[PDB]
Amino acid sequence: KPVNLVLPEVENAIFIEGYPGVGLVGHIAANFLAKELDMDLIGYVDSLFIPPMSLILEGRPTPPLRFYGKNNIIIAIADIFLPPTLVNEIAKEIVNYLKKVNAEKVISLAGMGIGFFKDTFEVWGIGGSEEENKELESLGVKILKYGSITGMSGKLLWEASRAGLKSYVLLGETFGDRPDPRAAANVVEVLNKMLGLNVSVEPLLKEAEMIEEQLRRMHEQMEEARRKMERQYETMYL
Amino acid sequence: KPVNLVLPEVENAIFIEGYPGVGLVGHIAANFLAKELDMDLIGYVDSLFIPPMSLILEGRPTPPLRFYGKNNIIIAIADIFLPPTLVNEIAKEIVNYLKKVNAEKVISLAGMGIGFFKDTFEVWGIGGSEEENKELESLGVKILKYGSITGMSGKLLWEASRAGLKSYVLLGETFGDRPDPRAAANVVEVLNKMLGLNVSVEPLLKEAEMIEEQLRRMHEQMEEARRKMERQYETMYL
Amino acid sequence: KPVNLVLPEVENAIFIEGYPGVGLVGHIAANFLAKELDMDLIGYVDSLFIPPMSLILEGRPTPPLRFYGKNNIIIAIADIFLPPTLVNEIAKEIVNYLKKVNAEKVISLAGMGIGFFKDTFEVWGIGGSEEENKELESLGVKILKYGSITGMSGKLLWEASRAGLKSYVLLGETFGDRPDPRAAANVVEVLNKMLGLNVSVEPLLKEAEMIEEQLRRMHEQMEEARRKMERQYETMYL
Amino acid sequence: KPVNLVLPEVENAIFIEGYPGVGLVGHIAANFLAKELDMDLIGYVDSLFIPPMSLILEGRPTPPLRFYGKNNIIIAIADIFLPPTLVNEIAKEIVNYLKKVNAEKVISLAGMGIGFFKDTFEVWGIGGSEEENKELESLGVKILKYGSITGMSGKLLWEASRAGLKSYVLLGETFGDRPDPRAAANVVEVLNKMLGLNVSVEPLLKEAEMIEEQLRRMHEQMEEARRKMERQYETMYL
Amino acid sequence: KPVNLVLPEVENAIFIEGYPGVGLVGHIAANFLAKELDMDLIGYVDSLFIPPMSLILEGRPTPPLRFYGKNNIIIAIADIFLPPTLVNEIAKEIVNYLKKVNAEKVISLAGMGIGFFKDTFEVWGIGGSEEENKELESLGVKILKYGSITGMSGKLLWEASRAGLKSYVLLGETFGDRPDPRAAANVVEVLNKMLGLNVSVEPLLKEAEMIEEQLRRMHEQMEEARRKMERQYETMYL
Numbered sequence A, B, C, D, E: 001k002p003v004n005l006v007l008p009e010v011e012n013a014i015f016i017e018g019y020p021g022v023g024l025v026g027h028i029a030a031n032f033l034a035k036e037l038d039m040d041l042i043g044y045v046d047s048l049f050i051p052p053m054s055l056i057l058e059g060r061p062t063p064p065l066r067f068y069g070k071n072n073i074i075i076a077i078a079d080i081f082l083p084p085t086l087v088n089e090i091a092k093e094i095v096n097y098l099k100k101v102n103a104e105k106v107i108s109l110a111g112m113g114i115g116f117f118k119d120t121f122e123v124w125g126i127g128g129s130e131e132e133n134k135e136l137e138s139l140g141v142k143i144l145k146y147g148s149i150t151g152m153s154g155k156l157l158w159e160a161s162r163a164g165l166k167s168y169v170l171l172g173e174t175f176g177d178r179p180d181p182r183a184a185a186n187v188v189e190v191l192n193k194m195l196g197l198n199v200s201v202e203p204l205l206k207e208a209e210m211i212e213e214q215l216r217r218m219h220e221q222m223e224e225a226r227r228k229m230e231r232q233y234e235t236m237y238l
């Protein structure tokens, strides 16, 4: 067997997947939820085809593909992109596990790279069947009419619905070229409504401001430093 | 088994295949027929070697290789190019299914990239045996004397005929560098005669005009906008 | 099993192979013989690793690797280059078949890319053993002393001789950069002497003249057309 | 199987691994310890996927992946980088061996590429569990809070701890672009404290000085030589 | 099984291997010995992963990897480089054969690419164990202290010694960028002393002179020809 899921059964699990993707939208959202709900590391994906590494998080070695849990919610995180065939093999194992445990919901978190000059960033959605499309509509999420969703999200959407599970994908609009905690927040907001979780997305919006403030400040200091050096060169040498 | 066909039996099926190819001729033709005959999604190809995705069509997740049906006609569609060995594996499974169900006809839809400065775009044809060549001649389709037909179309032509099925390929002449709904229409016209379907190719010809009108109009507005900006720069700054 | 030879037994077969190669010498020679001896398509090579296609010849679908026959002569043709390991696998199956049927002769047709400024184009030869070298000498074919022969020809030469079959390769000298029906003719001439076939190589030499006449004429008309356009531009605009 | 560990059992082994990596920090450290503790070559990794070579050390042929030993300490050395899947396969076999022999400690030596203009080069650490983190803290090694450790080190850290073994990684800060015996020395110092070995890191610090002195001296002589040649050209030819 | 050695048993064989490598030193040496000792072609390596070809030597088809013999000495020759894993597989089969027949010596011939401006070209050596190092010392061959020997030579050295066979590598220093019959001669001289063969290396040194004389002469005639053409252009056209 190329891929082994090492993951305890969690009956009627709500499974949320945020693999790396455009904007890191899914990934930031999933990681934020795992943190804010004080989830434990409950399992991981094991395969010879996952390249050798340990991530170190709060001084604990963790594998690159892992599962976090707090009673009934599982969150699936990855820190690497993976080749297509391996993704498919992992998706197979995940869907087997979700059938086994009669998972209540299968939710994939994703990003949609969508220009620069858009006023507000929406969250789009798609459901396994018309029933799930209706649910998403009733949380005021725009349903995606035409498109493609590649990667784990796209495969889970199809595979999980085909196995009779209620499956969804949320796609936060983002620039498409950078980590975007704001778009992740939009997605986490939709997830609050969907699951009644009441997690504040403030720390996420704070994080975004602090990054942008830091960038502005570093650019200021860089340019101020070269202007000082030019003025200094001229007074010394003209 | 590398490829699983998930497809109910349709006795004495007329199987039509329009995989992506030059001009998207086959693909547009097949997709148009599926739509205009209000076909249902009846099946799909499943394989670890098909890269992970869902297509979203009218807000429903669908796999990239799928089958549409309406009583006795099956239409095979793909939204991705596929590597040669996988194509061969899919062809094997398709031909097995068509033997099983005693398919009446196996028709591949394709394009022939053929210059720019040709007055009219023809439709060529080829049959599994001289019997099918004769049929195509009697619908005034030119028989291809010398050529190669690569991809699924070429393989099905040979494999299906070798298994005792009546097999054909229709090739719409096209530019060779762009989606061509007009050439698809030519092919759909030939398919009407062949199967007595009376599907209007008007919406297809309309679609082509609207695309071209839109392009012309956007190019007009683009060029008019830069001329305005030049005039504006000059009045402001000369 | 990666490669299946679908080929009826032909006792004491004279097997001639002309796979694509420098100059298309082998290939043109083999194809010409098959045509001029009104051979039938008697079989083919079947493998998932042969890329999907049908060639269309005289309006009949044929596979890319095929066998032509007329009582006791088999001619093996291919329309594609193939990767080394697959070539070896095909060679194995071919040699098994030739042992089975006690083949009388195993002849590979090939080209030798050899400069531009040579007056005459020779045909070289090599035999499985000194006995076959002697035969070739007695038809005034130069024996190749040192060299390598890659591809199917080289493998068959060795494998067929090692299985106790009389094996040969004929190599028509050619430019090395273009289809050369003249060099093919040289090879077919040697094959006439070797097998007493009396096939005229005139149509081949005719074909070469007509191609060269067409090229000269097109180049004339091209250059005459731009001279006319220059004269026309000058009279219009000076 | 694809990888065979040829290695005698050493009960309750202290296993130290220094595979090549940034700075050659791990590698230099491990190699130095093996030498200074007069270890014997006790085993090696054998695999068809290890490229064919012998290293020659003190006139003895040795394989590229080898194990050195002196009563209870095993040191694992490699002289080549290896592809990820092979690394994982080797890690599997190593961890199996370490379970078998109830290894006391599993220590990976590594480097951390970390800029140029840093005052001191530290040594960081990480442990399989909080118990080992505590040990490292009590030798005044900074515990790594966040990061990733790729390669054999990262995999062993996780795999060995998951099999109930006490596992650690030491990471010497280094420039990141060159062999760094100084950083290796820092790591060997930490290893002395951890295992009570009292190995002098002087020869290592000496080695670093001699390399740097040699570089400076060669650059001096090069530049002095071209200045002499310029002066000589001018006196000869002006 | 990927590689079959077709090679009669030769009890207590002296096995000499000269696979292509830097300078073609090994290869020229091995080939020269096979010729000068009037060896017969006794066997070959057979594998689907050896690319299809025949070499033609004195008008006989031979495989690219072959074995020459004269009572008790086997010489292994290859005319192609091979991928690492295949080399390892061939080495496995060779060492199995050498255990089977209780081979007396396993000698690899190789080159060491080593600059341009060296007065004399030495021959270095290395032995499987200290016993063989001593033998080589007693024929005044310098023992290599540190280095790596890649390819078949390196693998045989290790594998054959690990199977209890007496194994050696001789490395002729050479430029590193061209066929070097002189360095091959140096190696053949050492092989004479080692095995008491008294083969004159004169024809080899003669061959080198004739090549160099030919090069000088061709370069002379080339340059003399363009000078003549310049003089001729000037007298015609000034």
Ligand SMILES: [Cl-]
Pocket (backbone or CB within 6 Å): A020, A079, A080
């Ligand atoms: Cl990341």
Ligand SMILES: [Cl-]
Pocket (backbone or CB within 6 Å): A237, A238
């Ligand atoms: Cl200045």
Ligand SMILES: [Cl-]
Pocket (backbone or CB within 6 Å): B020, B079, B080
């Ligand atoms: Cl498309």
Ligand SMILES: [Cl-]
Pocket (backbone or CB within 6 Å): B237, B238
């Ligand atoms: Cl201006």
Ligand SMILES: [Cl-]
Pocket (backbone or CB within 6 Å): C020, C079, C080
């Ligand atoms: Cl061709």
Ligand SMILES: [Cl-]
Pocket (backbone or CB within 6 Å): D020, D079, D080
């Ligand atoms: Cl190294």
Ligand SMILES: [Cl-]
Pocket (backbone or CB within 6 Å): D237, D238
């Ligand atoms: Cl001067």
Ligand SMILES: [Cl-]
Pocket (backbone or CB within 6 Å): E020, E079, E080
């Ligand atoms: Cl060579």
